């Protein structure tokens, strides 16, 4: 539960003119970055990279270089009904819908992964929709070798 500190080794800031909009994470062996979040990621050898991909899932996936295979996190694919965590608190997974406390997310906190317990990345936060006291997430998880994005009713992209 102290192992949220290792996200800084597998995260990068992406800026459009000088201001940070989102984050390009580094799950597994592929740079993932949400397709809406624009700019140039703050890393030279990760900049010159042809990786423009699909937009039905809203991702933009890459292939990481060989000298940075060991700076990556650990991916997994199973999730039980439990208690997961990311940088701005602690979440839970009930019925296929991650929920956070209202106000812990701000417009500009996309690309944040979600760890389970062992520092294993489960999904990618990219949205949110205010139900009231709680708010649920729009999120891009993968069941098994097939990413499927989830979107509740009336979200907006952070």
């Amino acid at each position: 539960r102290m192992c949220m500190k290792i996200e800084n080794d597998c995260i990068f800031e992406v800026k459009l003119d000088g201001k940070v909009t989102g984050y390009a994470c580094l799950v597994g062996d592929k740079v993932m970055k949400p397709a809406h979040v624009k700019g140039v990621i703050d890393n030279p050898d990760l900049a010159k990279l042809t990786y423009k991909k699909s937009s039905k899932y809203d991702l933009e996936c890459a292939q990481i270089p060989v000298h940075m295979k060991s700076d990556a996190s650990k991916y997994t694919h199973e999730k039980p009904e439990g208690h997961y965590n990311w940088h701005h608190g602690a979440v839970q997974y009930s019925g296929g819908r991650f929920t956070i406390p209202t106000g812990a997310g701000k417009p500009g906190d996309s690309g944040r992964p979600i760890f389970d317990n062992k520092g294993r990345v489960v999904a990618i936060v990219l949205g949110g929709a205010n139900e009231g006291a709680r708010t649920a997430l729009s999120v891009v998880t993968w069941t098994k070798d097939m990413v499927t994005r989830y979107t509740p009713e009336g979200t907006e992209e952070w």
Partner: protein
Amino acid sequence: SAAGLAVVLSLLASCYMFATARRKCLTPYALTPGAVVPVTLGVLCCAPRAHA
């Protein structure tokens, strides 16, 4: 010559609609860190010959 040009604007369209259907059917398999389901290796000519 117009019939000699209505072929090439009707043989590229049926080749354009295979490259689109090749793309849309296996685009999530390239995004995840995962395999290719080798039945679709046989039917669709997939770019993972076995890599990525």
